[PDB]
Write a protein that binds this ligand. Structure first.
Ligand SMILES: [Zn+2]
Ligand SMILES: [Zn+2]
Lengths: 352, 352
């Protein structure tokens, strides 16, 4: 049947002093009847969301800054101070619940050296378990500069991730600037989970692949939410296009291109979570391609409801077991894959 | 178990007088060893691609303008003249092979009424079978203006599609303007099939859904290539988000929103093709969600090779039949779904 001790690791917060900014996210992502709960959860890591996690059989929650978080702060010095404030805040909150809470670093991604230094501080001094970054870092006096991490200057940062041996969770963020105006103004309800989020993350991680990040750093670990941000349904089409067009075309120009097949990266460097994607059928398709050991349960609180995400995994245990290859695979996805990936010791309900 | 008489309907051409424009497409989409074949095929609807189609068991090819085609022509008067020339040209070419060739209208989509009139001319006077439009119509310097068809003025055009009772094929196109520079300059090999194409089409058709196009025009027929442009893998997540967030939020503001579940539109208004997606596993997943009667074989020539797409469907007939639910489903996908959708009479090998 169902299990306790599940690990959930796409679980967002904001600094309480910025409560007013969370009402702006609520207007993008939260139905009216869910506003009271959203505001309580996003501002209280140890509040009712912890009680729900305990009731619903979560053993370890890894908290991260919400979106865009620092990636929406276009002034470098202000962005760097905010990221540090987020890390110091969540470190203080999780200190009282070490058996069931951890955190991922919030980072200013304006400068690779500075981001590497803050990640190192979070991991070595605060015991954080990785980084979670909300897609491209926006920058410039009017915010139009889009900083992607698949360019060579970011190699110092990837080297830091590998040296610390912690994963990088690439989370989505809403559209900004001319992209928001040109492509979303007339379909604003498509901002967020319906399409815009995965459109951005898939572009960015495929960018890391085709620009050779994982070839230069074969030990690098990256996590994608939402069962891989559109990519698994296109595993065949993307790899086929790389074989039929992209690889020989790039080679003919002397341009950098990924050295391995698409699935190699998804079987060695990338892990997927079930955040906001409580779909047994989609989970099955993903398992069939990447392996049950490469998918991690997660909720996506507070944008999703802990009781709903845990309810799916718990209440459909038998059907999910059939879909993912048996009892061990089900416990691996629920808990044991993440326990091993994050090198967690004993934690709440971890052997239950 | 293979069949002849297959229908293939994402098969592109360019006007011979614009041969020079095809070189820019080759630099985006065609490996060096495939250039000679691409140039021959894109400029000769009755050339070797017809010989290959006859050899490989295609009974009916529906030709369409390549991409962006008119959607990249930013000046309305020139765009309208080009679309007319494309339609008159392809009408003349297919006249010599009526038993095995048809066409979809090329349209200037600067003005809903003007596009409606050209579609009517193509259907009523030239016998065309629908329209194929390459995503948003570009206008303005560098194409920075993006004209989407999910805004209320486009109801004039949707009413025309319903009056004529023909489908609208929403095909992808490359990025333009600031989006091209900001989001693709550092990952240029992701322009096209790897991600950019489906990112645009999925945004656009989901836009039509959430702005209520299919609620006001429940008889409207739309076709998507590439097994649905990322949407099927996200069927659960999109509909869940619409239920949990978007529909109650829009209702609370009095904003228009899709009245029915996402899968209703994919089971009533939208058909998928296999263009560029010769994946038995992805096809199976789509069949399980939308029904085998809603998926149409297609190749995507000349960007894909007719021998490769037909080779997949023909050589793996037994495995595909098992994946899609049996012989009738296999013949439906190969031929009979399209025969019925486009009301084709007898055609070459149509009872084979
Ligand atoms: Zn999230
Ligand atoms: Zn095509």
């Amino acid at each position: 049947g169902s299990m306790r001790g599940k690990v959930s690791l796409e679980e967002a917060f904001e600094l309480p002093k910025f409560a007013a900014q969370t009402k702006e996210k609520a207007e993008l992502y939260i139905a009216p009847n869910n506003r009271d709960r959203y505001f309580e959860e996003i501002l209280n890591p140890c509040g009712n969301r912890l009680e729900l996690s305990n009731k619903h059989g979560i053993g370890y929650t890894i908290y991260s800054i919400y979106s865009p978080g620092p990636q929406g702060w276009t002034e470098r010095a202000e962005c760097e101070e905010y990221a540090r404030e987020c890390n110091d805040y969540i470190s203080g909150e999780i200190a009282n619940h070490k058996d069931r809470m951890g955190a991922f670093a919030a980072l200013s991604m304006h400068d690779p050296k500075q981001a590497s230094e803050e990640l190192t501080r979070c991991v070595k001094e605060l015991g954080f378990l990785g980084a979670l970054v909300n897609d491209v870092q926006h920058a410039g006096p009017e915010g139009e500069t889009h900083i992607f991490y698949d360019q060579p200057e970011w190699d110092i940062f990837w080297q830091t991730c590998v040296d610390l041996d912690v994963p990088f969770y690439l989370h989505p963020e809403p559209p900004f600037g001319s992209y928001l105006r040109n492509q979303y103004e007339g379909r604003k309800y498509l901002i967020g989970p319906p399409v815009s989020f995965a459109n951005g993350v898939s572009l960015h991680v495929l960018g890391m692949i085709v620009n050779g990040v994982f070839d230069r750093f074969p030990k690098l670990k990256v996590i994608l939410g939402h069962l891989g941000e559109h990519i698994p349904g296109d595993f065949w089409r993307i790899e086929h296009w790389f074989e039929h067009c992209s690889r020989p075309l790039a080679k003919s120009r002397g341009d950098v291109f990924a050295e391995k097949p698409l699935l190699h990266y998804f079987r060695n460097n990338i892990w997927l979570t079930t955040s906001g994607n409580f779909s047994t059928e989609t989970l099955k398709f993903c398992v069939e391609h990447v392996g049950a050991e490469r998918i991690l349960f997660s909720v996506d609180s507070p944008y999703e409801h802990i009781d709903v995400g845990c309810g799916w995994y718990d209440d459909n245990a038998k059907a999910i077991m059939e879909a993912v290859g048996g009892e061990k695979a089900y416990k691996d996805i629920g808990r044991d894959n993440a326990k091993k990936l994050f090198k967690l010791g004993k934690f709440y309900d971890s052997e239950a």
